[model samples]
Every structure is written in C-alpha cells, then in structure tokens.
Target: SKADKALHDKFLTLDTHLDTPAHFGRPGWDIADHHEVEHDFSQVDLPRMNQGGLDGGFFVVYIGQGELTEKGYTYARDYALHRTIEIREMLAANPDTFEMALTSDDARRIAKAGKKFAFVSMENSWPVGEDLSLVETFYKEGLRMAGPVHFRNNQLADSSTDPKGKIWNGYSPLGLRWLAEANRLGIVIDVSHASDDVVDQSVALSKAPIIASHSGPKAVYDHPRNLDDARLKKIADAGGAICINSIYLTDTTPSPEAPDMKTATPEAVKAYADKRAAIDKAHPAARGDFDLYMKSMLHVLKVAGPKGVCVGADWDGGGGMDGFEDITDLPKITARLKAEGYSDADIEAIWSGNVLRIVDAAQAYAKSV
Candidate 1:
C-alpha cells in the first residue's frame, strides 16, 4: 500500500474539535436522524463520519465570549449546559451511532471495537461564572477538557482581540485559579484565543499541556487569530498542540490593504456581519463554498509544519472549513494531507494519535486521584 493508504487504512482518524449541537435545540433535530437536520451536517453525521473513516471527535460545548457580567456569564453557562444536555440526549437517542468517551480507556476501547467515540470539550471557561466549583461540575458532566477563555477577554484570561492588550482586571484571577483546578481534574487547557500574556500565564500555571484548538500560524498571516512564532514554539515546548484554522479568511491570507473594520461603513459592515452571523446561526459547524477554506489550510500548513499542527474544526460553534465541507468530505482532508506530501507517520500524528497521547496522560492524572 502507498504511504497515504497506510496512513488512511491503519490509523484511526480523530478530529479533536467539531460543532453541530445547535441543531439539537430545534424540535426535531437528532444526531442519529441525520437526514432531519435543518442545516447541513452531513459531513459530521454518523454515516458520513464512518464512511470518511473519522471514527471519533470531540464535540465541543462552546459559548461565545462576551461581556464579563453576572448576566453574561449566566447566559453563557445556561446556553452551554443546555447544549451539553442536548448532546447527552442525542447520544441516548442514538446509542447505535454515538458513544461517550469519558476516559482514555473509553476512547481506546471504542476505537478498538471500530466504533465512533464522542469526547466533550469546553471552549470558554466564562460559563463557570467566577467559581472554581463549577469546574468540577463540568468535569462530572463529562468535560474531559477545557479552555479558560475564548475569542475575547472575559472572566478568564486576556484575548488576542484586545487592541490595547488589556486583560480582565489584570490576569482574570478566577481564570488562573481554574487553570490549576482543571489540571487537577485532568482537563487539557486550551489557549487559542488568549493573549500572549495569557498564554504565558497558562504555561506557568497548568500542570498539563495546553492546546490552541483552532489557531493558525502567524508566520503565514499576521492576524490576531493566528499563533505567532513565539506562541507556536511555546505551545510545542509546553507539549500542547496547535490546530490550524480553516477559515478566518483575510485574517489567514496575506492581504496588505484589507479594510480596517473600525473605519468601514457602518451599514455595509453591518450587513456583512449580519449575513455572516445568520449563516453561522444556521450552519454553525461548516460554512462557505469550501474551496476557499482549503486554500487557507494549505497556506497555514506550509508555514506551521507537522509537529505543531492538528484539526480543530470550529464546527457548530462558528464557521466551518473547506475540503471538509461535511463529515463525508473528511477523507478528502486526509487525501489532501497526502497530496500535501505528509508521510503516514506525520498524518497519524495529526489524526488521532497526537491528541490521544495527551488524552491518555490527562486520564492517567485524573485516575491517579
């Protein structure tokens, strides 16, 4: 068999991140009843996932980062918890298609049996609402991993989106506390949207490796969302993974004269923003025509290389990616990786192997208790 075939044939494909839970809120949406989706989730649905050889994924419970307030935190928490409830319900409803993976043992056993494993991750810690106790609650709810912050500065760490580099009351003391707590609970810390200082803080505080779940390499594109050289080296040094983003458009592409959002027309920008938001709400998992996102990934990989990269499909939580328009197209992603000249070993590292290693370590630490 060819190296690519060996990679595809022998190695189990695991996507560390994906979204599609929003549909669970609708009256008739069901993960097992794939054809019932009001939106297109065909790519990540059971049959497509299996057909594409994607045996497992971490379905994220993500709440958009926003104002740090009692109400804001409450909404985020309520929304995320509701989604988690929905995910559990979906699994229960579709026992034949989905199984929860609460431990490395669970994941390994399911994989060995050739079944799809669904791992849970929390994107923003804002929902914890300034309390450390909630961390354990989330864990008990089956959150095997967590990130202290998301795209903007909240109750946790600083966000890269801050122009003044401001942090929430200087380091979001609650976030710092939870980082240690999450580690103690065996959760992987993610620093994708956190600022440089926040990343530094996480590195110093966390007992386990942190990850950039859907970040890109800044060396290729100078955007707030992409990780710079220092960030990448630090994440790799800390033994965490950086899953490059597939979308973020101009942010990932090299465009010298891109329009500055602040100065752009209020009406025009609002329309664009509204359209994007509507699309996101309708098809939160994947977006666009697909080809554009693939090019962005290609550019990102050219700069980031294999060791520091993985997939974090930012799915239902936000925009989707290219080549992987749906779960059915996932094999195209592996085929694309092969076409990019990655060897089987490297592809294995990118697929499920790398994250599984971290998951195993986290599970060990969790069980050590």
Candidate 2:
C-alpha cells in the first residue's frame, strides 16, 4: 500500500479517455512529433506523458454518428476499423515506447513496470451495424468496449437527441443483447454519449460493471450530454465509474461572461461539430474550435467529487480544452486537483484505481465463464 502511495506520489496518473488517435492519419499529426500549428496539444507522446504523470490512457476509436444505413454504417465501420489499424501500427512501430493493454492484469503490469498503458474503446456501435457477431469480433480484435450508439439512435440504442424521447431499444435491445455478449466476453460496455434510456437499460442488464468512459455531471449543468444525479448513482451502483473531462462544457463553473455553468446536450455537440465541419469544409485548413471546452471541466470538478471524476480528454474526438491543450498538460490537472484539496488517494481513484477496480471485476467475470 505504501509502495502504491509512493509510486502514486511520484508518478501514477491515468487519463481514462482521449480522442487524439483520430488524427493518426492527419498530416503531420504524429503523437511523437510536434505539430507546427496554432493549437499543438495533438500529441500525447510518451515524453509529455511522463512529464504529466500519465502512466496510461485509453486511445479511443470513435466514429461520427451518421444515418444508420448500409452505406453509412459501412463507411463508419470501415473508418473505425481503419483507425484501429493506424493505432496498432503506431504502437507496433515503437513497441519499445508503447504497449497495448487489454486486461487489468496487463495495465497493472505495464504501469508497475514503468510504461504507459494503452487501452482501446470504440465509441459508437454504428460500425457494428446490426451484426451481433461483429461485437465479439471487435473484442477479439482488441476492442475492450463499445457504446450502443452515439449522437442519434442506431440499431442498438436511442440517443437523448430524438424527441421520440425513449424507445424500447432506446433502452437498447440490440445494444442490450450485444452488451450481454460483451460482458460474457470481457468487453466493457461504455455508456458515454448514449441516451438516458440506454444508460438506464444497460445499468439494469449488464452482468458486471459498465463505464461512462468520458462523461460528466448533467445535474450540475442540465445538459443532455451530461448525466443526471440519478444516472450517476445508477452507474456507481452498477459498479461503474465516470471519466471527468478537463474541458469546460461538462464542468460549467463561473466564467467572465456567465457566472453560472453551461450544460451541453447532444444537439449542442452535433451543432458544434456541424459548425466546425462547415468551417473546415468552407475554409481550407480551418479547424473547428470551441474556446470554453476546458473551462467546463474545471467547473465540473468544483461540482462533482474528485472520486466520481477521471480524465476523459476527448483527444481527437474534438477534445482540445483551454489551458491543457494536449496530453502533455494532463498532469497539470493533477496539480490542479491537488490544489483543489483532493488527497493522493482521491486522485488515484479518479486516475487508475477506480478503473482498475472495474477492470479487475470485468476480468474476474470473464474468467468465471
């Protein structure tokens, strides 16, 4: 225990989620190389990680929510699979530097051996596209988790966006079925960006722990994108943990313009992404940027306990926050957490401990079968 504490004090941080891997194929977007751009947090390279007290992070393979069609799902599926290839190649090209961990055992071993742990999660199930078997295939292909849907409803689940409110599968029949399969097979069922009904259903049906890998408190901000206190309690009760963001939308603290916080809904996420996409499309090299993304995360920390929060830097998933732009500044959050009066243990639960407990339970569940 003292050794754990000592290592934690020295260097034991874990950012549970990041979106940077999406830029793997982007020109000059190598994690190890410094991008010559106005915004330069694109790289979560090992050097910055070590400096930031980050021992491991989950590089998410996410796809934008699109129409659920043969062609659309095919494109989404292929796109996501292609990204996975890119991530693996990046790790393979530098095994001396990066290693992929699929189990809690692997994560602990890697961190204990003084290496950064690389975990994987595919953010949406559109790629699965109605094929139940594909779920297991993804797991076998090293996917540790999958969400039933993203911005809108898909074969698996409903989103908070549709005025349809909640549907049966909104609770996610397809998602529920696949989730049972995932749990039986050791893949974590992720609820980030899922509809409230989906969240409720998954919490009710999951045989083991589920994870809101990169979400925050809706109770604080009242955003559909954020979880309400009831959902948070359900998640905690179902043996899951929430990954807190450093970006501001979910945090919603007092700002220069608004003394109150702002909650982000699915519509807001779509609108922001659409606006950015339009700008980038209309103006070549014009990147979509949100200035307050980071500030909201700080506000969330003020509102939610450190124990229920963890870093889910939507890295390449459009998660470049204000102060800590890239993976390099992840440690700064820890410093901020300390400044905020979080004990080292509290920080651990937020970092690796809480997730580790989930992983252990998941793995044990996997072994039971």
Candidate 3:
C-alpha cells in the first residue's frame, strides 16, 4: 500500500478520457469544490484528483449524436463549440490551478509547475458537420484528440454498437476525409466507439499512431465496443494505445426494462411494477468489480504489452464499478498493477507516458507534413 501510493504520486498521471467537463455545466457546481458521486454524481474534481494522485487528464467536449439533418448539425455545432468553451472557461477561471495542455511537452511542463493539466478532446466530431474545415478549427481551438462518431452512425463513421448495424462496415467516404483532417491537424484519432472496420482502416490509413482513448479488450468481454485480440495487436503494431474502458467488462448496463421503469405510462404502472420486481429479482447490475476492471486492463497489457496499454476508465462517462467508483479510487489500480508484477516504469507508462507518446507521434507527423 505504501509503495503503491508512492508510485502513483510519483508519476505524471493522466487519464485519456475524463467526462468531468460535462459536470461543469451543472448549476451551482464548481470544479474547485468537492462533489460526491453519491450526492451529485460528479466523479472528477480538484479535491478528488488531488487525493487520487492524478496530475491531469483530457477533459472531454462530448456531444451526443442527433438527427442526420442540416438543423441537427447546426444545433450540434453550437452545442459542441459551447461545450469546448466551457472547458476553456474553467481553465481561465482557475488559471493558477489549471492550465490547458496542447502538446506533450506542455503537459509535462504544466504538471511540473504543480498545476493540473487539461487536454481538450472532442468525444464526437458531429459538430464538424459536413465541413472538414471544422477539424482545423477545433485543432486551432486546442482540440488535441478527436473521434468521428459516438453511439450511432453519422456523417463520418459507423458506430460499433449502432442498433442498425454497420452502414459502411467502416469509414464512409467523408469519414476517410475526417481521418485525413485529423491526421493533418495532429489530433490523436480516437477509435473507442468506432466500428471494427473503422479501427482496421484507421490503422491502415493514419500517418501516425491512433488511440482508442477509452476502449476495452473483447477477449475479456465480447461486447461490440471492445476490440478483438488481432485488432488490438494491429493497433499495437501501428503504435496505438487502448486505454481500457471500465464499462462492458461483463454487463454493467441496465436491462431494457430498466428504462421503461422510469418513463412508463400511468396505465402501465402495473407493468412498471413488474419491471421493478423483475429488476430486484435479477442479480446485481454489475458482476464485474474493480478486480474485473483490472482483469480487462491486464488482458490488454498481455496482448498489447505495456506500450500499447493505458488507463481510461471513462470516468464520469459511464465508468466506475463495484470497487472502482470514482477518481478517488485510482491508486487501487496502481497498487494492483504493482501487485501483479508490473514494473514501476510500465505502470507509469500506462498512467500517462504511452498516451503522450501517441500525442507526440500525432503532432510529429503533422509537423512533418
């Protein structure tokens, strides 16, 4: 325990995906103030990350998918740009405590200054709409990472978990342009929510290494969102990293009936009652605990090795489990990795080094061009 804390505190720890930026929009909320996941469902905060020994991470600009129409794109564009500003406003409001990290060097320097680093990442590029110029626009606005799609198929790429299945089986024509613009601008291409062929094509196409900013290994859990072994290895060969996600380890989501329980019709209250009873009758929502989360990460480490493995956990964005509930519980991961015989250097790389290397690679390629 002593060693774990020491090592965790020793490194420049960074999570590739932190949805804490979403919490910034909550009324009467402040990142400086301590907020409980139990009380406000807020996971990341200055106090918590300080206590958890996290130096910094990517504070995401996430916009949920919308209708594939002109009106939807207009709304999404405004929403996403506003969300990006929300992240910037937080840094400006707390200049002494937070600094926006644009390059890998910036992250190291900012963390060295004892200020928490914030790397801005767009969780979905729907706001880019039909125009690829938005890619450069976002990159100039400090978007260091970008993903083409989320949850469903859109203008760019197909989603792995789309209910309707693959449209292009991979990147659409515009999606390829999306990938090109991301490369040209040095944005770390994220494949966490991409379809399998999209991941494959990214490996085939990107000039620099890509990253699954928050994805897990399918060998551990055969979910559509998780990558299979060969593909994981392919990403590894391409110098990419798979920052394992915490959800989908086994079955963390609620049943289909769980949703109906909340928005059920008054006449169907009896059915809602049945749904509640059935939920109670079923086993716990998540059989996967903290150990299981680590099991998934470790499995990826085994297949992809230390350089290819990183910690994402999808904090505040459908991450957290039985033992791993919040950022405060992060040391448990460092502890487990050490207990599992991972070298200190290996653990540190998993914490931040590998991801930054990918960042460097992306920027390097962009500079070369």
Candidate 4:
C-alpha cells in the first residue's frame, strides 16, 4: 500500500472526464469545500482531489441533447456557453488554488506549480447549433476537447444508446463538418457517446487521433455504450485511447417510478432525494465494484495495450461503483496496476501520458495546417 501510494503521488495524474462542472451551478456550493457523494451527491471537490492524488482533469461543458428546432438549439447554445463561463469563473475565483490548462504543456506546468489544473471539454455538440463557427469560438475560450453527440441523435451524429435507433447511420453531413472543425482547431474529438459508425468514420476522417473520453470494452460487458474488440484495436492502431468508464458493466435494472425534479420546491427536492435513497436500498444501480471496474480496464489493456489505455472513470457523471465511489478512491487503481506488474512508465502513461500525447498529436496537426 505504501509503495502504491508513493508511485501514485509521483506521477501527474489526470482523468479525461470530470463531470463535476455539472455541480458548479449549485447554490451555496464551493469546489474548495468537502462533500460526500452519499450526503450531498457531489464528488471531486478540492479535498477529494487532494486525497485521491489527482493533479488535474477536464471539467466538462456538457449540454444535454434536446430538440432539433431553432428554439431548442438557441437555448442549448446559451446553456453550454454559460456552463463554460461557470468553469472559468470557478478557476478565476480559486486562482490561488486552480488554474486553467489550454495545452498539454499547460497541464504539466500547472501541476508542476503544485496547483490543480482544469481543462475545459465540450461533452455534446448540440450547443454548436448548426453553426460550425462556435467550434472556433469555444476553442478560443479554451475548449480543447469536443464530442459530437450524447445519448440521442442530433444534428451532428448518431448515439450509441439512442432509444430511437440509428438515424444518420453515422456522422451526418453536418457531423463530418463538425469533425473537420474540431481537427482544424486541434480539439480532441471524443466518441464516447457516439455510435460505432461514428467512431469508425471519425478515425478514418480525422487527421488526428480520436478518443473515447469515457467508455469500456464491449468484450468485458456487452453494452452498446462499450466498444467491441475490433474497434478497440482499430482505435489503438490509429493512435487513439479508450479511457475506461465505471458504468454499463452489467444490466442495471431501473426502478419503475422516479420522483419529479421539475421544480426546486423544498418538497420536490426532498422527494427526489428520498426516492434516490429508497432505490439505493432496494436495488443498487451498479453492482460493479472496484474489481469489476479493473476487470474492464485490464480487458482493454489486453486488447489495446498500455499505449491505448487511460483513466476517465466518468467521475461526477453517473459513474462510480461500490468501492470506487469518489475521486478519493483513485489510488486503488494505481495499486491494481502495480500488482499486475505494469512498469511505472506504463502506469504513468495510463494515468496521463497517453491522453496528453493524443492531445499533443491533435495540436501538432492543427499547427501543421
């Protein structure tokens, strides 16, 4: 345990996905304060980050998928822009403790300065709203990573778990342009929530390698959200990475009823929290504990090798299993890798090196053009 802790503390660890920005809007909440996932339903605050030995990660600008109308796009665009500002404001307010990272070099620099780094990522492209210029706009605002779609098909690309099934069959005409714009601006294209066809096409089209910002191996668990072996190898061969996810490891049955959170009325909020507690007591959502999470990771490492493996974990984004509830439990991963006989260099690559290399590759191509 001491050995693992020492190794973990030695590297500049980074998770490719940190959905903690979703909590940035909460009233009376602060990232500097400690909170429990069970009590407050919040994870990845400064205390937890330090406890987990995480140096930095991408704080997402996640715009949920919405209607394909002019009004819907307009609202989504404004919401996403505001979310980006929220992340920046967090860094500005915590300037003494947190700093914004724009490049791979910035990540290293910020971490070296003993301050946490926050990199902005766009989880869904609906906010781009039929205009590709927003890609450059967000880029100038420090968006280093972008994904075309989320849980449903939109103007950009089809989703892996869309309830309505395949629409564009892959990236739509606009989606292809989205991919190009991302590459042109050096934004690392994420295919995590996209359909298999989208992953294939993006890999074939992009001048830079793409990443599944947070996903698992379908071979380990047969979920559409997870990638098949061939695709995993394809991404690795194309110089991409698959940061393992902590969800979809098994069929998690849902409760028949859920509380409505349409309004923030005191009664409504309490009702929602009560319903969540009841569900957890009856049928726990994820039975996939830390071992199962590592099983998925090892499976990917076997197929994709160390160079293609990284950590995303989807923290604060409907992720986390039994023993891996929060960022504070991250060292367990480093410990497991060590037990598996992975060299420190390889383990460090899994932590942050591979993802940064992919980021560097995308930026390199952008500079070349």
Candidate 5:
C-alpha cells in the first residue's frame, strides 16, 4: 500500500473535473481549512488534496441550462463570469498552494513548483449565450475546456439527460459555430453532459483533440450518461481522451417513493428516515462502489489506451461512491491500476499526462490562429 501510494504521489497527478470552485465563494468556506464531506458535503480543500496527493486539475465554472431567453442568457453569463473570478480569487489567496493553469506548460510548471494547478473549464456552454465572442473573454479569464450542454439543451447543443429528446440531433447552427469558436480559441471541447451526436460532431470537426472531462463507459452499467464501446474507440481514434468518471457506474435513478431531501422539512426528514429504513431493510443491495469505478476506468483504458484515458472523478460534483469517497481514497485507484498490470507510466498518464497533452494541442491550435 505504501508502494502504491508512493507511486501515486510520484506522478504529476490531476483530476480533470473538479467542481470545487462552486464552493470558493460560499459564505465562511475556506479551501485552506479542512472540512468534512459529511458536514459541509464538500470534498476538496488544501488539506484533503495534500492527503490525497492531488496536484489539482480543472475547476469547473458550471452554469445550469436555463431558458433560451435573452434575459436568462445575461444571468448565466454574469454568473459564469463570477464563478471564474471565484477560481482566480481562490488562487490569489493561496498562491503557494494553487496557481491557475491555462496551458500544458502551466500545468507542468505549476506542478514542478509543488503548487496545485487550477485549470478552468466551462461545464455548460449555455453561459456564453448566443454570442460566441464571450469565449475569448472566458479564455482570457483562464477557461481551457468547455462543454456545449448540461442537463438540458440550450442554444448550442442537446444534453444526454434532457427529459425532452434531442433538439437538433446534434449541434444546432449556433452550436456548430460554438464548436468552431472553441477550436479557434484553443479551448478543449468537453462532451461530458452532451448528447452522443455532439460528441461525434465535436470529434469529427475540432482541429484539436476533445475530452469528456467526466464520463463513463456504458458497458459498465448502460446509463445514458455513459458512452458505448464503439464511441469510446471513436474518441480514441480521433486522438481524444475520456477521463473516466466515478459516477454513472450503475442505475442512479431515484425511486418514486424516495423523499426529496433538498426541500424536506425536519419532520419530513425524520419520517423519510423511517421510510428509508423499511426500504433498505427489504434487500439492501443498491451498490455502486469503488470496484465499479475501476471497472469503468479499466474498460475505458482498453478502448482508449493510456494516451486516450485520464481521471476526473468529478469531485465535489456529485461524484464519489462508497469506497472511493474522496481525494484521500485516490490511492486505491493507483493501487488497483498497478495491480491490474498498468505500468507506472501508464498510471501516470491516466492520472494527468494524457489530458495535459490535449491541453497542449488545444493551445497550440489557438496560437497558430
């Protein structure tokens, strides 16, 4: 175990999908202070990352899909900008521990300096609205990766989990332009929450390799959020990488009888606990754990190879499971991969190098333009 952890810590590690920036501006929250996943439901902070040996990765600026109205556009755009600022502010306040990374070189340089690198990614392109020029603004603000859609379709593209089916079958007109703008600006196109068609189109059209910052393999559990084997190969064939996700490893749909915890009253919470006790007593086997997480990664690696695979456990973004609960649990992943016969180099690439190469390609394309 020490060997595995030592090997893990030896790599230039990263997780491509950290939604932790969402916590940066929260009242009384501090990334410097350690917090419990149980208490605040937070996952990463400086202390936890050190314990986990995370050298940092993309801190997402995720904007939920909203009405396509111009008013909603301004709201998301402003909110997205503020979230980006929150990431920089976090870095500013903790320069010794964190630095914003825009290029692959920045990632390497920051890591070499023993600082965690924070690369910004827009989780949903909806925040940029119909106007594509705003990507430049975002780029200037340290955005390096972006996806076209989230839970629902917006102006750019369709989402995998939209209650309503595919709106455009793929990219809409503006969506196509959005893809081009991203390429032109050297932003890695992330298709994690996008429809299959969006992934296909992005791979076929982008000048640089694309990434699924937090995605899983459908063969592992067959969820809409996960990709099929053929699609995984397609991405690999196109020189892109799939940063295997920890979520979506099994059926995660909520039971109709399940209580809505978010809005439940304290009395209702107590009632649901009893109700859930009865439910859990029935069979007690709804399991999506660490092994399932590794199965997805191993499968993705087989299809994508070390050069086409990476990790993005989706930390602080509804990620993690029973065994792989937080960054501190990351060494299990390193241990498992090594036990599975992956090389130290292969494991390192999966941890960070593969995706960082994509960063190089994206920024190189931008520089050429």
Candidate 6:
C-alpha cells in the first residue's frame, strides 16, 4: 500500500473541471479548512487536495442556462463575473496555499513551489451575453478554458440535455463566432454539456485541439452527457482529449428531490447542506462507486488510449461516487493503474501531460494567428 501510494503521488496530477468556485462565496466557508463530504457535500479542499496528491485543477465559473432574453442575459453575465471574483477572492485569502495558473507550465511551477494551482474556466457562456469582447476580458482575468452551453440550450449552442430539444442543431451563428473568439484568445474550448453536434462541429472547425473537460464515454453508459466511441476517436485524431467524468457511468434519477432552501443567506446555505446530508444518509443514490468509475475510464482508454484520456471527476459539481467520496481518494486510481502495469510515463500522460499537451497546442495555435 505504501509503495502504491508513493507511485501514485509521483506525478503532476491535475483535474480539468472543478466547480468548487461556486462554494467560495458561502458565508464563513474557507478553502483552507477541511470539510467532510458527508457533512458538507464538498469533495475538494486544500487539506484533501494535498492528501489526495492533487496538485491543481481548473476552478469553473459555471452559469446555468436561464431565459435568453436581454434581461436574463444581463443577469447571467453579472452573476458569472461575480463568481469569477469569488475565485479570485479565494486565491487572495489564501495566497500561501493557492496560486492562479495561466499557462499549462504554471501547473508544474506552482505545484513544485508547494502551492496548489487554480486555473479559471467558464463552464457556460450564458454569462458572456452577445458580446464576444467579454471573452478577452475574462481571458485577462485568467480564464484559460470555456464552454458554450450547460444543462440547457442558450444563445451560444444547443445543450445535450435540453428538455425542449436542440435549438441550433449545433452552434448558432453567434456560437460560431464565439468558437472563433475562444480559439483566437487561446482559451481551450470545452465541449462538455454540449450537443453531439457541437462536439462534431468543434472537431471539424477549430484550428486547435478541443476538449470535453468533464464527460464520459456514451459507450460506457448511454447518456447525452457522455460521448460515443466514434467521437472519442475524432477528438483523439484531432489531437484533443476527453477528461473523463465521475458521473453518467450508470442510470441516475431524472430529478432527485433536494433541500429547497435558497442559498441567499449563510444560514439558509447551511440548512440546505444539512438537509442534503440527511438525504444522503437515509437514501443514497444507487450510483456505483470507485470501481464503476474505473470501468468507465478503462473502457475509454481502450478506445482513446492514454493520450486521449484525462481526469476531471466534476468535483463539487455532482461528481464522486461511493468510495471515491472526495479528492483524498485519488490515490486509489493511481494504485489501480500501477497494478494494471501501466508505465510511469503513460500514467503521467493520463494524469496531466496529455491535458497540458492539448492546452499547449491550443495556445500555440492561437499565437500563430
């Protein structure tokens, strides 16, 4: 076990999607403080990150799709920007433990310095409104990655999970420009939560490699949030990567009931978390745990190979299963890979090298233009 743990911690590990920024603004919440997944519904924090051998990852600024009206657009834009500030506030509050990562190289530098790396990413472009200029503004704010849609269709692109159905069939006219803007700005385009058409279009149109920052293989589990094997090969052939997610490996409920407290006040937030804890204790979802997650990864590896796969786990954004409750359990994955006879070089690629290669390619192409 000690040898397995040692081998596990010997890489520059990084996850691509972390929605933990959503929790940064919670009243009295501290990223430096240790929190239990069972009690707080959080899976990543500094203490757990270190214990888990997680060096760094992207902190998402996610804006859920709302009404596409002008008023709704304005609200989403402001909300998303404020959430970005929340991430900045976290870095400022704990300068010693966390640092912002801009280039792919920053991950190694910051980690080597013994500080956690936090790269900012936009999960939904609903916040960008119709203004393509905001992409550059956010890039100045250190947003190295972005996605055009979330759980529902918006102005940019059709969502994979839109209840009403596909809107643009893929990227709308505005969405096409958004894609160009992202590429021009060197921000890696994320295809997660987008329609299959969107993924296909990204592979066909972009001048650089694209990424499904947090997604699974649909072949492993038939879900819209997951990509099919054909598209997995498309991404790989295009020199991109799909950072595997911890969800959608099995059937999940349509809409599980949750505590209905508005997170407007700190007290309400705590109450909401408490209610969630009770629900988790009384009737946990039937989703399989760590082994199921590994099966999903191994299946993708068989199709995409080590270079095509990376880890995102969707921490704090409906990620984590039974045994892999928090980031602290990440060593299990490394141990499993070693037991399977993967070389250190291959494991390094899966952990961070492949993802950074895509990042480097995106930025390099951006500079060429």
Best by lDDT: 4
Clashing pairs in 4: none
User: CA lDDT of 66 in candidate 1?
Assistant: 71
- Candidate order by lDDT, decreasing, is 4, 6, 3, 5, 1, 2
Candidate 5 residue 175 Cα shift, in angstroms, is 0.8
**Residue range 104-207, candidate 6, lDDT tens digits:** 88888898899999999999899878988988988998899899999999999999999999989999999999999999989999999999999999999999
Candidate 5 whole-model C-alpha lDDT, 0 to 1: 0.86
Model 5 C-alpha lDDT per residue in residues 94-172, reported as the tens digit of each score: 9888888888888889989989888999898898887889989999998889988999988999899999898898899
Point out where model 4 deviates above 4 Å: 1-3, 254-275
lDDT (CA) per prediction:
0.69, 0.67, 0.88, 0.90, 0.86, 0.89
Listed in order, each prediction's TM-score against the native is 0.80, 0.79, 0.91, 0.95, 0.92, 0.95
Q: Model 4 over residues 1-369: C-alpha lDDT tens digits?
A: 576567789888999999999877776669999987875677799998998999999899997889999999899989998999999989989998899999999999999898999888989899988999999999998899988999999999999999999999999999999899899999999999999999999989999999999999988899999999999999999999999999989777765743332335546655667777777878777457999999999999999999999999999898888999999889999999988999999999999999999999999999999
Clashing pairs in 1: 19-316, 43-326, 43-327, 43-328, 44-327, 285-315, 285-316, 286-320
Superposed Cα deviation of residue 138, candidate 3 (Å)? 1.0
lDDT of 3 by residue, 275-354 (tens): 65466457446557998998899999999999999988899897888878898889999888888999989988999999
- Greater TM-score among 4 and 5 belongs to 4
lDDT of 2 by residue, 170-197 (tens): 5556666777778888887778878887
TM-score of 6: 0.95
RMSD of each: 7.2, 8.3, 4.8, 2.1, 3.6, 2.0
True lDDT of residue 362, candidate 6: 84
Which regions in candidate 1 have their CA more than 4 angstroms from the true location? 1-9, 35-43, 163-165, 249-305, 321-323, 366-369
Candidate 3, residue 22: how far the Cα is off, in Å: 1.1
| Residue 118 lDDT (model 5) | 87
| Candidate 2 deviant stretches above 4 angstroms | 1-9, 36-43, 162-169, 247-307
Better of 2 and 3 by TM-score: 3
